Amino acid sequence: QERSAANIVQVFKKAAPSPISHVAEIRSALEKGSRLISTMQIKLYGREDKGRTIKATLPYVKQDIPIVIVFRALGVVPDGEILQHICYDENDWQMLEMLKPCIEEGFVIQDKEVALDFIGEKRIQYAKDILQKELLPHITQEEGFETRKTFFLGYMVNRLLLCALERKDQDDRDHFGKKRLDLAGPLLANLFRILFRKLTREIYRYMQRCIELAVKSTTITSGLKYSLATGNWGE
Amino acid sequence: MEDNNRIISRLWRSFRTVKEMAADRGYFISQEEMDQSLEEFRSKICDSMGNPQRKLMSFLANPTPEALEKYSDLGTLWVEFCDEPSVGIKTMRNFCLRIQEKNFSTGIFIYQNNITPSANKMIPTVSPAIIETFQESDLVVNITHHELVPKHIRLSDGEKSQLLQRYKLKESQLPRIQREDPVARYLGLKRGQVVKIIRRSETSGRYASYRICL
Amino acid sequence: ASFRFCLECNNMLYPKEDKENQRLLYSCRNCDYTELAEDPKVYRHELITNIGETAGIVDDIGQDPTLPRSDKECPECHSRDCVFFQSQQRRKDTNMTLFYVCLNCKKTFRDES
Amino acid sequence: IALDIEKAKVIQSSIEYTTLKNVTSATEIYYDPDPTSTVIEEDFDTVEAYFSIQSPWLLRLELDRARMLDKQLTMNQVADKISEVFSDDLFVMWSEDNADKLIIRCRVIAEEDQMLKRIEAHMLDLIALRGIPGISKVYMVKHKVSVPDESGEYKNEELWALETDGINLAEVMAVPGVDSSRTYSNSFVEILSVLGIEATRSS
Amino acid sequence: LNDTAKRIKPTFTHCEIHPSMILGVAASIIPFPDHNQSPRN
Amino acid sequence: TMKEITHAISSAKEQVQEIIYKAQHNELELKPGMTLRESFEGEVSRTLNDARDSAGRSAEMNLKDLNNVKQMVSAGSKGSFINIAQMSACVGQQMVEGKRIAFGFADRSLPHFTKDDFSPESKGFVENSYLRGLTPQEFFFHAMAGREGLIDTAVKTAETGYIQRRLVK
Amino acid sequence: GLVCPAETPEGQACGLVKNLSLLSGISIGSPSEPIINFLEEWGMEPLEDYDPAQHTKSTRIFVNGVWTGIHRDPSMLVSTMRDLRRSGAISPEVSIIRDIRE
Ligand SMILES: [Zn+2]
Ligand SMILES: [Zn+2]
């Protein structure tokens, strides 16, 4: 079973009839461990004309958020320390220009407090959570690595414009190299989890009857069978 | 000459069209009265420098010797112009009354850009008579003169009550045409009138179709 | 060029006019800091680009086998082992001239005529 | 006018909607507060020669040469239009087609650097120079049209014809030089609403 | 130089083990697939 | 004849190299209504096409009135010039969506080529005849062209029928 | 190279069903660290402290879609790991791509 690989930088132009100009995406999943299937969407409204914001989509967030806040929300509030990460050439006025209107957007939030706030003390605390378990979940969910991702989020918005400025073509959607193939071994995983997780909460039910062996090891036998027999993976 | 020499030249083709339309409808006009060259037109409704006074363009016309034979009660027509690129409820009464007394039956105001919603809400306020509104930029070229546009013709309630009888048709069973159709307007059709179409046919030579105006 | 921002509250620099003295000043709208203008140029648009054709050419651009070999001769060391290509500006309106670079100088001489 | 080669063009360039955006190679906004000298060398003269028989904001434009040679235009013309577009609230100056550097200076007449940026687009995307709108590319063609010679017999009498790459009718009908008795847009959708259900069918 | 019968032939870093290895089971059994209209193969 | 053809492809190759040189110098004009790139295309296509077109025609008049394949073309019972051509002379240039083989690999047709190679052996021109047995590259391109055919042939087959059903109903 | 061009079902899904070539193979899963180490022990100044202007042509390296810092002159660092693999101490299955043009 073929499937567009994950953890890679792409960029797509989106048709004249649409409030969005171009967009870049990146599918992320832990190479070893659960394998979450939540993708990061860093859109770019305002077509290649109209008077051009930059918003990105996060898991559980209703609307989309403007990149600026995301920097201050990480731990970098001042400029030039930000372009440090984005641009690797102070003499690239073109790129820089585009960004101007955007800084003004977030100009209304001048610190980390409100930054982690606007995402609707309880939420701010929750905000952190959404950065260690939702924000770019691959790479690692440890703690003291905040810095690196900032350089990433800079390298992305970069790769973006590099196309949005007709310097690099739109990413070849069917460039097989950026496609993987889940053979037998891999399949028995994403399938298993769905099961074992129902097995997890099954042994939870027996303990929720014990007003004080039992495990019918056929559900892991018959479950597997169902799929392989018919062709219906998911439980 | 500047670029105002042309702002007359266009208003003129738009003019000439009206004429043609007035004559095709079934009215009086001398071939000369239609062939009033752009030259002898300029010097007639212009002041000094080069601005046009429409208040002096309006006129009357009447039913030819023939038209009374097929269409009995076909009244007299009246075309009026205005220099106000946005005419309103006031210069309206100038029209609304002007006909309500003279007693014509056919009003044809030529709004340059547009009449007011407060204004036009007084058109069916002078019945039996009816009034139509035509934008300027839509009358510079007569659409009937076109190659694909075939010559049409109206039909008396006799020739109509015949057609229907001759083919045993129930009106609804007849090909339609929109009331706000460019040609339908041009000939001032009405909900209930028929129109005979005569066009070329690469199989027999000439076919005769008819469209009623719903 | 390499223009600048400003210390204290590290932000973008917006310009303002030095009224009483008639000259251009630059500033900040977060604190108060103000430094004069580095250059009178503020914004440029360019609807018919030409910048980015020379696209990053590290000396190592001679070990990438997927590139063509031309036997011309640079405007300086006068060698005869040069590589080339066309503008990297993916613009449907660009042109198709060849720019050549020599591994023993780094010029940008064309083949045009 | 049938085989009048230049007459074809003479109308072509009078219908094909050309906008400032397709001739501007670049645009910049410098700061020059002195309406009696420039901070530019190759500009000096053009100031001094403007002292014989307002706002501090300057605006310079770098137009493309070959694009001004293609569709053919003149600074005198170009500006003339601009001026009557805005009128009494925008002073503009300009070099002359002869020079080795085309330039266009200008000034106007609570945060101005934001407004004079909104007026950057409205100038580059809401200002047409020549043409009825929506009609880009316009090629020319010589078609084969058989026809009745005066001597009776039918014969080869080819005539030039203009084909477009866009669709506007209401306007391109009343254009000096066409036969608004033969005009035709392939957009049947339009035609029926404009020329009457009949002509639609024909199409 | 060459024979006017055979097929006309038109820094190197790597070589192809053999072009006839890009095929899978199906085409692998077809003799001279380079002489038929490809869509037929 | 197999020789007489060869130098009509060699010369045509140079008649291409000439206009590629004359293009990598901006010494060519944009055919009105088309982009310099599009206008680049416009010539290569009309060059390779006209080459193959006469390439075959050379053999056509070289095949006597007894040649069976010919007979089956005169009779009108199968195939036409084109067919013979692609089997005895030059198959031709391959193409998809109207334009010569794209650049799926960054700035090149295949990795076996030097980047920015605009020549015909890269843009999909099969110079060989079926009788001579195509080269790998050529063999590949050819398929991608045919591949396009089968696509709609498994879509227009019933979509025309869709379009049809409406017309009926 | 990877897939056979001809073998594929007619009609319906056609080209959505591909068969593998003879020489093609799929990866299995090697280890990152024995090369991460091998990097941060040969010239690899960690990403953490970077200066875009001070470090102009710093060749950045990505690992499985992650940015594990940059590196100065890579040319030697490169043709050593690849030679280490050829002897077989870091699985022949890993992929290493250098995009000089960037
Ligand atoms: Zn500050
Ligand atoms: Zn050199």
mmCIF file with all atom_site columns, N, CA and C in Angstrom, chain B residues 117-148:
data_model
loop_
_atom_site.group_PDB
_atom_site.id
_atom_site.type_symbol
_atom_site.label_atom_id
_atom_site.label_alt_id
_atom_site.label_comp_id
_atom_site.label_asym_id
_atom_site.label_entity_id
_atom_site.label_seq_id
_atom_site.pdbx_PDB_ins_code
_atom_site.Cartn_x
_atom_site.Cartn_y
_atom_site.Cartn_z
_atom_site.occupancy
_atom_site.B_iso_or_equiv
_atom_site.pdbx_formal_charge
_atom_site.auth_seq_id
_atom_site.auth_comp_id
_atom_site.auth_asym_id
_atom_site.auth_atom_id
_atom_site.pdbx_PDB_model_num
ATOM 1  N N  . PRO B 1 117 ? -34.805 54.320 -7.855  1.00 0.00 ? 117 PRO B N  1
ATOM 2  C CA . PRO B 1 117 ? -35.814 53.337 -7.438  1.00 0.00 ? 117 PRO B CA 1
ATOM 3  C C  . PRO B 1 117 ? -37.077 54.006 -6.898  1.00 0.00 ? 117 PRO B C  1
ATOM 4  N N  . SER B 1 118 ? -36.949 55.252 -6.449  1.00 0.00 ? 118 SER B N  1
ATOM 5  C CA . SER B 1 118 ? -38.074 56.014 -5.923  1.00 0.00 ? 118 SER B CA 1
ATOM 6  C C  . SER B 1 118 ? -38.846 56.514 -7.138  1.00 0.00 ? 118 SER B C  1
ATOM 7  N N  . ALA B 1 119 ? -38.084 56.850 -8.173  1.00 0.00 ? 119 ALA B N  1
ATOM 8  C CA . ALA B 1 119 ? -38.589 57.369 -9.438  1.00 0.00 ? 119 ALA B CA 1
ATOM 9  C C  . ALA B 1 119 ? -39.469 56.326 -10.127 1.00 0.00 ? 119 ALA B C  1
ATOM 10 N N  . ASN B 1 120 ? -38.857 55.437 -10.908 1.00 0.00 ? 120 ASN B N  1
ATOM 11 C CA . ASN B 1 120 ? -39.578 54.403 -11.665 1.00 0.00 ? 120 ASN B CA 1
ATOM 12 C C  . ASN B 1 120 ? -40.783 53.736 -10.980 1.00 0.00 ? 120 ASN B C  1
ATOM 13 N N  . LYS B 1 121 ? -40.908 53.852 -9.660  1.00 0.00 ? 121 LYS B N  1
ATOM 14 C CA . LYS B 1 121 ? -42.062 53.275 -8.971  1.00 0.00 ? 121 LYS B CA 1
ATOM 15 C C  . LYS B 1 121 ? -43.314 54.121 -9.208  1.00 0.00 ? 121 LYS B C  1
ATOM 16 N N  . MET B 1 122 ? -43.402 54.745 -10.382 1.00 0.00 ? 122 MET B N  1
ATOM 17 C CA . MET B 1 122 ? -44.534 55.591 -10.736 1.00 0.00 ? 122 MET B CA 1
ATOM 18 C C  . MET B 1 122 ? -44.811 55.409 -12.222 1.00 0.00 ? 122 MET B C  1
ATOM 19 N N  . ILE B 1 123 ? -44.298 54.316 -12.780 1.00 0.00 ? 123 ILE B N  1
ATOM 20 C CA . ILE B 1 123 ? -44.491 54.024 -14.195 1.00 0.00 ? 123 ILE B CA 1
ATOM 21 C C  . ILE B 1 123 ? -45.920 53.411 -14.255 1.00 0.00 ? 123 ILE B C  1
ATOM 22 N N  . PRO B 1 124 ? -46.240 52.289 -13.555 1.00 0.00 ? 124 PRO B N  1
ATOM 23 C CA . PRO B 1 124 ? -47.637 51.887 -13.768 1.00 0.00 ? 124 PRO B CA 1
ATOM 24 C C  . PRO B 1 124 ? -48.652 52.818 -13.087 1.00 0.00 ? 124 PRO B C  1
ATOM 25 N N  . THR B 1 125 ? -48.280 54.076 -12.866 1.00 0.00 ? 125 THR B N  1
ATOM 26 C CA . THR B 1 125 ? -49.157 55.032 -12.203 1.00 0.00 ? 125 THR B CA 1
ATOM 27 C C  . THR B 1 125 ? -49.838 55.940 -13.217 1.00 0.00 ? 125 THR B C  1
ATOM 28 N N  . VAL B 1 126 ? -49.760 55.545 -14.484 1.00 0.00 ? 126 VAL B N  1
ATOM 29 C CA . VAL B 1 126 ? -50.378 56.285 -15.579 1.00 0.00 ? 126 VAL B CA 1
ATOM 30 C C  . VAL B 1 126 ? -50.896 55.311 -16.639 1.00 0.00 ? 126 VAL B C  1
ATOM 31 N N  . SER B 1 127 ? -51.806 54.439 -16.216 1.00 0.00 ? 127 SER B N  1
ATOM 32 C CA . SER B 1 127 ? -52.397 53.462 -17.113 1.00 0.00 ? 127 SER B CA 1
ATOM 33 C C  . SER B 1 127 ? -53.503 54.173 -17.883 1.00 0.00 ? 127 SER B C  1
ATOM 34 N N  . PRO B 1 128 ? -53.945 53.607 -19.020 1.00 0.00 ? 128 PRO B N  1
ATOM 35 C CA . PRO B 1 128 ? -53.552 52.379 -19.723 1.00 0.00 ? 128 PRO B CA 1
ATOM 36 C C  . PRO B 1 128 ? -52.082 52.363 -20.155 1.00 0.00 ? 128 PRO B C  1
ATOM 37 N N  . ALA B 1 129 ? -51.631 53.503 -20.679 1.00 0.00 ? 129 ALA B N  1
ATOM 38 C CA . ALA B 1 129 ? -50.268 53.741 -21.168 1.00 0.00 ? 129 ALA B CA 1
ATOM 39 C C  . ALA B 1 129 ? -49.161 53.004 -20.418 1.00 0.00 ? 129 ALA B C  1
ATOM 40 N N  . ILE B 1 130 ? -48.086 52.699 -21.136 1.00 0.00 ? 130 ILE B N  1
ATOM 41 C CA . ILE B 1 130 ? -46.945 52.000 -20.559 1.00 0.00 ? 130 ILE B CA 1
ATOM 42 C C  . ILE B 1 130 ? -45.641 52.665 -20.985 1.00 0.00 ? 130 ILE B C  1
ATOM 43 N N  . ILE B 1 131 ? -44.648 52.604 -20.104 1.00 0.00 ? 131 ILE B N  1
ATOM 44 C CA . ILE B 1 131 ? -43.352 53.231 -20.335 1.00 0.00 ? 131 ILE B CA 1
ATOM 45 C C  . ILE B 1 131 ? -42.194 52.251 -20.219 1.00 0.00 ? 131 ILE B C  1
ATOM 46 N N  . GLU B 1 132 ? -41.192 52.444 -21.070 1.00 0.00 ? 132 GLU B N  1
ATOM 47 C CA . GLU B 1 132 ? -40.020 51.584 -21.082 1.00 0.00 ? 132 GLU B CA 1
ATOM 48 C C  . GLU B 1 132 ? -38.778 52.410 -20.791 1.00 0.00 ? 132 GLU B C  1
ATOM 49 N N  . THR B 1 133 ? -37.738 51.732 -20.317 1.00 0.00 ? 133 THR B N  1
ATOM 50 C CA . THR B 1 133 ? -36.482 52.374 -19.967 1.00 0.00 ? 133 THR B CA 1
ATOM 51 C C  . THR B 1 133 ? -35.338 51.656 -20.674 1.00 0.00 ? 133 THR B C  1
ATOM 52 N N  . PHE B 1 134 ? -34.519 52.434 -21.379 1.00 0.00 ? 134 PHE B N  1
ATOM 53 C CA . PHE B 1 134 ? -33.373 51.920 -22.133 1.00 0.00 ? 134 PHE B CA 1
ATOM 54 C C  . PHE B 1 134 ? -32.071 52.650 -21.819 1.00 0.00 ? 134 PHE B C  1
ATOM 55 N N  . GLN B 1 135 ? -31.053 51.886 -21.432 1.00 0.00 ? 135 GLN B N  1
ATOM 56 C CA . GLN B 1 135 ? -29.739 52.439 -21.130 1.00 0.00 ? 135 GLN B CA 1
ATOM 57 C C  . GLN B 1 135 ? -29.128 52.949 -22.428 1.00 0.00 ? 135 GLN B C  1
ATOM 58 N N  . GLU B 1 136 ? -28.294 53.979 -22.325 1.00 0.00 ? 136 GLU B N  1
ATOM 59 C CA . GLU B 1 136 ? -27.641 54.559 -23.493 1.00 0.00 ? 136 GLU B CA 1
ATOM 60 C C  . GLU B 1 136 ? -26.653 53.585 -24.129 1.00 0.00 ? 136 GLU B C  1
ATOM 61 N N  . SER B 1 137 ? -25.602 53.236 -23.389 1.00 0.00 ? 137 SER B N  1
ATOM 62 C CA . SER B 1 137 ? -24.549 52.330 -23.870 1.00 0.00 ? 137 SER B CA 1
ATOM 63 C C  . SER B 1 137 ? -25.026 50.989 -24.455 1.00 0.00 ? 137 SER B C  1
ATOM 64 N N  . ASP B 1 138 ? -26.335 50.760 -24.460 1.00 0.00 ? 138 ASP B N  1
ATOM 65 C CA . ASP B 1 138 ? -26.911 49.528 -24.992 1.00 0.00 ? 138 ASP B CA 1
ATOM 66 C C  . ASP B 1 138 ? -27.692 49.754 -26.285 1.00 0.00 ? 138 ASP B C  1
ATOM 67 N N  . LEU B 1 139 ? -27.652 50.982 -26.795 1.00 0.00 ? 139 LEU B N  1
ATOM 68 C CA . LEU B 1 139 ? -28.367 51.311 -28.023 1.00 0.00 ? 139 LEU B CA 1
ATOM 69 C C  . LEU B 1 139 ? -27.494 51.954 -29.091 1.00 0.00 ? 139 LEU B C  1
ATOM 70 N N  . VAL B 1 140 ? -26.176 51.877 -28.941 1.00 0.00 ? 140 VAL B N  1
ATOM 71 C CA . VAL B 1 140 ? -25.285 52.479 -29.927 1.00 0.00 ? 140 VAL B CA 1
ATOM 72 C C  . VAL B 1 140 ? -25.397 51.757 -31.274 1.00 0.00 ? 140 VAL B C  1
ATOM 73 N N  . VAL B 1 141 ? -25.566 50.440 -31.232 1.00 0.00 ? 141 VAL B N  1
ATOM 74 C CA . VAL B 1 141 ? -25.707 49.647 -32.451 1.00 0.00 ? 141 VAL B CA 1
ATOM 75 C C  . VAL B 1 141 ? -27.014 48.856 -32.468 1.00 0.00 ? 141 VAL B C  1
ATOM 76 N N  . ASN B 1 142 ? -27.805 49.025 -33.525 1.00 0.00 ? 142 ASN B N  1
ATOM 77 C CA . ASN B 1 142 ? -29.063 48.298 -33.645 1.00 0.00 ? 142 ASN B CA 1
ATOM 78 C C  . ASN B 1 142 ? -28.786 46.818 -33.826 1.00 0.00 ? 142 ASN B C  1
ATOM 79 N N  . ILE B 1 143 ? -29.295 46.018 -32.896 1.00 0.00 ? 143 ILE B N  1
ATOM 80 C CA . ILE B 1 143 ? -29.086 44.580 -32.927 1.00 0.00 ? 143 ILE B CA 1
ATOM 81 C C  . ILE B 1 143 ? -29.800 43.821 -34.043 1.00 0.00 ? 143 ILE B C  1
ATOM 82 N N  . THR B 1 144 ? -30.860 44.390 -34.608 1.00 0.00 ? 144 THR B N  1
ATOM 83 C CA . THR B 1 144 ? -31.603 43.673 -35.642 1.00 0.00 ? 144 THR B CA 1
ATOM 84 C C  . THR B 1 144 ? -30.793 43.631 -36.929 1.00 0.00 ? 144 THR B C  1
ATOM 85 N N  . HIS B 1 145 ? -30.085 44.723 -37.201 1.00 0.00 ? 145 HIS B N  1
ATOM 86 C CA . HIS B 1 145 ? -29.252 44.853 -38.393 1.00 0.00 ? 145 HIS B CA 1
ATOM 87 C C  . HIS B 1 145 ? -28.232 43.718 -38.537 1.00 0.00 ? 145 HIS B C  1
ATOM 88 N N  . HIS B 1 146 ? -27.932 43.044 -37.427 1.00 0.00 ? 146 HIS B N  1
ATOM 89 C CA . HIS B 1 146 ? -26.940 41.966 -37.410 1.00 0.00 ? 146 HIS B CA 1
ATOM 90 C C  . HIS B 1 146 ? -27.255 40.758 -38.291 1.00 0.00 ? 146 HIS B C  1
ATOM 91 N N  . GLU B 1 147 ? -26.190 40.131 -38.785 1.00 0.00 ? 147 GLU B N  1
ATOM 92 C CA . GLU B 1 147 ? -26.273 38.954 -39.644 1.00 0.00 ? 147 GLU B CA 1
ATOM 93 C C  . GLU B 1 147 ? -27.120 37.832 -39.063 1.00 0.00 ? 147 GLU B C  1
ATOM 94 N N  . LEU B 1 148 ? -26.775 37.386 -37.856 1.00 0.00 ? 148 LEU B N  1
ATOM 95 C CA . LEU B 1 148 ? -27.510 36.285 -37.238 1.00 0.00 ? 148 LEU B CA 1
ATOM 96 C C  . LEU B 1 148 ? -28.935 36.632 -36.830 1.00 0.00 ? 148 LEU B C  1
#
